[PDB]
């Protein structure tokens, strides 16, 4: 009935509380910081073998092996140092939108338009990779998936929900609801206690893995948020959307901290990733090239052109030595 | 320079060979995207089967005149089409099913969906095969009710021939390119072979046009 009035009053109170703790801006504080030079990155390796659009990829925790999922029903696992194909996994459903690599490295994950998250065991005594789990229960397509501890996995789906699954059982341990549009991406905190999810309602939400609540929501974008990633510290994150912005929010301040727009860019943003120290922000666009931003000064510091189509996936190794970018021209490039 | 990395390179080369063979085998197949609204009549089209638990996508596999067809039905997604339609950019053709027996302006929403799909930024070259289903029920409906309920601006009389032709021409004119893609239309009949023959002919024409573009003759 009139409960909309109470909701609007609470929203106004939240806005006023956020305003009351906004004394300065990060740009003003960092205006005295010496800028970084023109970040020049060169392509070291090019990985060939995919015959369709590469839709997702993920680094291993050893910063040497990486999994790559493509629309030809392939889940190729590469050794990046020598460009050797360690594994080639065929998928029952060729419509894949995400892939993940277990922190230990014994499992990989896959998912897509079939609403199923498949967990494949890499280390078997038979010498072949066989599917070990086929988690099902999501109604929409799967947009992202991330391993927690080789037995728990968080999956965001296109039915405006997320789930936490226990792999050995196959049932959703927890279900996260509250988004209005499709959840397009998620990222885990470094301690794997919280995770942020960005949805198509131009909103991001911080969820507690344990006891499954939504702690705080962040707005400010004008379109669907396609990518999200946590700061290395764990107290901030960055979200890229279709309005050509890479807005960086802070958890503790509960406010927007910085926007990374530019008049030249007019496209959406597909992937967002940070550096080891958090001083650089790498974002993949539809201009077929990636951009590097000074995370503290919102100044572009380099371009990673070299792809003939939309850059769909982007990631940085845990040791931070290289950056892997994969695009729709069926090629993955390592930059250093 | 290599001690047992040579065997790793050999394994990688074998993997590459397997990938190449699988890619060729997959590229030697025809892929179609089945689309339509609710109660459109996709059942009478997918009933021509000649060869899962997930309610996310349906793959119908069949063959005709040694040609291999895989048809993808994505009607169990209920999400925004712009989120996952780009996955079907390289399909050979779209197969759009429209029911002629509709009234809650169902034909209006079918026309809106057709206009949205045809003028999509991804399907700027893929052809569309239009299947007008339930022609006999439409004939009974027009014998009972006038066509002016759906289109009050209709000037012709009320007979199956001219009304069907008017609907077909309106759907054809709903296209906004008319220069890079073609629309093939068929009125679905009770014979199980005529529909597949029409699909085969349209696919052959699309293949010929694609080869003309590839060979530099266009």
């Amino acid at each position, epitope marked *: 009935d009139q409960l909309r009035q109470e909701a609007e009053q609470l929203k106004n109170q939240i806005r006023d509380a956020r305003k009351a703790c906004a004394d300065a801006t990060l740009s003003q504080i960092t205006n005295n910081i010496d800028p970084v030079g023109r970040i020049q990155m060169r392509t070291r390796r090019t990985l060939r073998g995919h015959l369709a659009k590469i839709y997702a990829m993920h680094w291993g925790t050893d910063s*040497r*092996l990486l999994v790559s999922a493509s629309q030809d029903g392939k889940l190729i696992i590469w*050794d990046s140092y020598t460009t*050797n194909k*360690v*594994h080639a996994i065929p998928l029952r459903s060729s419509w894949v939108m995400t892939c993940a690599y277990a922190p230990s490295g014994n499992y990989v994950a896959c998912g897509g338009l079939d609403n199923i998250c498949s967990i494949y065991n890499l280390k078997t*005594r*038979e*010498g*072949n990779v066989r599917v070990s789990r086929e988690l099902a229960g999501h109604t929409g397509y799967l947009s992202c998936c991330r391993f927690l501890d080789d037995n728990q996995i968080v999956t965001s789906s296109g039915d405006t929900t997320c789930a936490l699954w226990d792999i050995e059982t196959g049932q959703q341990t927890t279900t996260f609801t509250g988004h209005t549009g499709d959840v397009m991406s998620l990222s885990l905190a470094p301690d794997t206690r919280l995770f942020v999810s960005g949805a198509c309602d131009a909103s991001a939400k911080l969820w507690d893995v344990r006891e499954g609540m939504c702690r705080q929501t962040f707005t400010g974008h004008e379109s669907d948020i396609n990518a999200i990633c946590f700061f290395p510290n764990g107290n901030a994150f960055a979200t890229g959307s279709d309005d050509a912005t890479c807005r960086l929010f802070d958890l503790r301040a509960d406010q927007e901290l910085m926007t990374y727009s530019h008049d030249n860019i007019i496209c959406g943003i597909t992937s967002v990733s940070f550096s080891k120290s958090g001083r650089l922000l790498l974002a993949g666009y539809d201009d077929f090239n990636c951009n590097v931003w000074d995370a503290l000064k919102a100044d572009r510091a380099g371009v990673l052109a070299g792809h003939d189509n939309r850059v769909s996936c982007l990631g940085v190794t845990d040791d931070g030595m290289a950056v892997a970018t994969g695009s729709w021209d069926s090629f993955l490039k390592i930059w250093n | *320079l290599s*001690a*047992e*990395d*040579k*065997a*790793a390179v*050999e*394994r990688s080369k*074998m993997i590459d060979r397997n990938l190449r063979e699988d890619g060729e085998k997959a590229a030697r197949e025809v892929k179609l995207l089945l689309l339509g609204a609710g109660e459109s009549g996709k059942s009478t089209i997918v009933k021509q089967m000649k060869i899962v638990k997930t309610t996310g996508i349906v793959e119908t596999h069949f063959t005709f005149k040694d040609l291999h067809f895989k048809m993808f039905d994505v009607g169990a997604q209920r999400s925004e089409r712009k989120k996952w339609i780009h996955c079907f950019e390289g399909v050979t053709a779209i197969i759009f099913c429209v029911a002629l027996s509709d009234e809650m302006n169902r034909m209006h929403e079918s026309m809106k969906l057709f206009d949205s799909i045809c003028n999509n930024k991804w399907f700027t070259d893929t052809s569309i095969i239009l299947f007008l289903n339930k022609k006999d029920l439409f004939e009974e409906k027009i014998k009972k009710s006038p066509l002016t309920i759906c289109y009050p601006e209709y000037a012709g009389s009320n007979t199956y021939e001219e009304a069907a032709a008017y609907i077909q021409c309106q759907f054809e004119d709903l296209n906004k390119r008319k220069d890079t893609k073609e629309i093939y239309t068929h009125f679905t009949c009770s014979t199980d072979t005529k529909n597949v023959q029409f699909v085969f002919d349209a696919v052959t024409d699309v293949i010929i046009k694609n080869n003309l573009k590839d060979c530099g003759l266009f």
Partner: single-chain antibody, 232 residues
Framework: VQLVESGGGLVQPGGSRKLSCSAS????????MHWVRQAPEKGLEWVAY????????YYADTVKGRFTISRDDPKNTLFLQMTSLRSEDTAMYYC??????????????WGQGTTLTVSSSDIVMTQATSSVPVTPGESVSISCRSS???????????LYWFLQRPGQSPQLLIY???NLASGVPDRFSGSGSGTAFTLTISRLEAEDVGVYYC?????????FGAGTKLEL
């Protein structure tokens, strides 16, 4: 997972034989296969190797020319055809599987082997000690030494430690000098540098008695060197 060998027996000198190795329980097409022979009361000696897909084939010097290793993948079988069997070929032959990629463990599984009896430079691995008297509950150190450094430019030291219990086929313990195999108890450990390597057993039990062998995988001749016996 098992490999069963057949075709052994007694052969007159100058004859011919065909040993067969049937594999069941694993993807035979993805594994390279070695034939390794052990003479009566002597150390193991590498004989032959055929890769996956039969791309590359390697033979030992003593058996090159008169031996031929082949595989048939549809039927999951490995063949060793040997002619002109001299009196020095009497041994027990073992069928070994090994897969090679990044982080793999080659030589992980050994067949039971078959006995064949016949009537009447590159690199060397040295194990100075041949037998030590040991008691349960104490730590043992077994040392191995090579003529050429096993370290490579990619950071890998290609040294493998195998254990052969009395009356059983050898079982892999350590690969790449520092990695514990699958199912090997934690108490086993391996270390070393370049030329000198050591294997340590912390608190042994009655199941650790047997012969320990070191093996190199840097240059393909694949020398072994006589093992060290642990009893009592």
């Amino acid at each position: 997972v098992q490999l069963v060998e057949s075709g052994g027996g007694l052969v007159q000198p100058g004859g011919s034989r065909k040993l067969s190795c049937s594999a069941s329980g694993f993807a035979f097409s993805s594994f390279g296969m070695h034939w390794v022979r052990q003479a009566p009361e002597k150390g193991l000696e590498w004989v032959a190797y055929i890769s996956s897909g039969s791309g590359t084939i390697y033979y030992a010097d003593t058996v090159k020319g008169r031996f031929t290793i082949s595989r048939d993948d549809p039927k999951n079988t490995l063949f060793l055809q040997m002619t002109s069997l001299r009196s020095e070929d009497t041994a027990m032959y073992y069928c070994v599987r090994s897969i090679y990629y990044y982080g793999s463990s080659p030589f992980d599984f050994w067949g039971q082997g078959t006995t064949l009896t016949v009537s009447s430079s590159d690199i060397v691995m040295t194990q100075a000690t041949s037998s030590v008297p040991v008691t349960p509950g104490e730590s043992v150190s077994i040392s191995c030494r090579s003529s050429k450094s096993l370290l490579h430019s990619n950071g890998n030291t290609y040294l493998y430690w195998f254990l052969q219990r009395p009356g059983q086929s050898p079982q892999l313990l350590i690969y790449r000098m520092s990695n514990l195999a699958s199912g090997v108890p934690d108490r086993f450990s391996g270390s070393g540098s370049g030329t000198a390597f050591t294997l340590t057993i912390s608190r042994l039990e009655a199941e650790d008695v047997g012969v320990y062998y070191c093996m190199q995988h840097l240059e393909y001749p694949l020398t072994f060197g006589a093992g060290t016996k642990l009893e009592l």
